[PDB]
């Protein structure tokens, strides 16, 4: 039907991703290519596997520039829809800094504008361990990012380089390289503006998250940490690996005073533009409908609400 048509193609932007260019990436955004263009979007999903960081010649930003220019040949608009997720949000920002007029708006979902503090946490241990393994948290890590792209000959130093772009130094950097309106001040934990005028181009800024992860005590030095996605005996702990994976990861962050996470991005850090809500009870795959759908008996649907915001960006006249 027409619920989520908007005027400009909507482009999925991935970004947890693998090191093989040959990859495979429809099933990244779960169910919702299919979900949108049921609706009557024009959706456009971005695979950039093999490309690192954002900000390079021959990086994540470029590329998705490359795709972009693709999609628009292809279905003859002049501006797209960008939605990133993690990373993703990050390049989307690259895209439209970079070539204003191409770009409609950019949404983010759960991206570290602020970095991540479990990134942060894996650059210290791997000063003592290259390997970072003797941790069990990052291990855990390692297994749920395997789980979501795939062992392509490796998971290990893929997962790795996949949180060395997100760690508060180099978003500092990014941040400083590549101003938005979106963005509130460094420390404020508030958000910039909705829009944008860049280039004679307006631009839609919004964003979400997840808080599922929040603090509870401390005791003796250390402070707990509860996902609240989850009800006693969820089966989404056990049909689900990335459920208290991203819990574990959480408490770490918590205890690098993050304060309220999906497990790898915190509330503060997420905020980018019009946040519509950071009160979901994900963690940082429910975003993207993760691991293959399940979710906790409290998270809401991830399918629904990027739907929903289609459809928002339909009435917004873009
Ligand atoms: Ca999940």
Known sequence: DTYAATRYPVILVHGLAGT???????????????????????????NLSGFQSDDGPNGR????????????????????????????????????????????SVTTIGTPHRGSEFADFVQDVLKTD??????????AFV????????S??????????????????????????????????????????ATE?????????????????????TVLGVTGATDTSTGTL???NVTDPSTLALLAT??????????????????????????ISTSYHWNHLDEINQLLGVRGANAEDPVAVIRTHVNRLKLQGV
């Open 250 to 275: 959480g408490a770490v962050m918590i205890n690098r005073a993050s304060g309220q996470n999906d497990g790898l991005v915190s509330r503060c850090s997420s905020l980018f533009g019009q946040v």
């Open 143 to 150: 297994n749920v990012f395997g789980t979501l792209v795939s």
């Open 197 to 217: 005028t860049v280039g004679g181009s307006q631009h839609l800024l919004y964003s979400w998250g997840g808080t599922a992860i929040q603090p509870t005590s």
């Open 20 to 46: 093989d260019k040959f990859a495979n990436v429809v099933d990244y955004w779960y169910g919702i290519q299919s979900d949108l263009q049921s609706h009557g979007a024009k959706v456009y999903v971005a």
């Open 152 to 193: 392509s000959h490796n998971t290990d130093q893929d997962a790795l380089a996949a949180l060395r772009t997100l760690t508060t130094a180099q978003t500092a950097t990014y941040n400083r390289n590549f101003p938005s309106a979106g963005l509130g001040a460094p420390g404020s934990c508030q958000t910039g503006a």
């Open 234 to 236: 969820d089966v989404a």
């Open 61 to 104: 930003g470029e590329q998705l520039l490359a795709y972009v220019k693709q999609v628009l040949a292809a279905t003859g608009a002049t501006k797209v829809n960008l939605i990133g997720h993690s990373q993703g949000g990050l390049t989307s920002r690259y895209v439209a800094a970079v070539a204003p007029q191409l770009v409609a």
């Open 130 to 139: 290259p390997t970072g393994l003797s941790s069990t948290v990052i291990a």
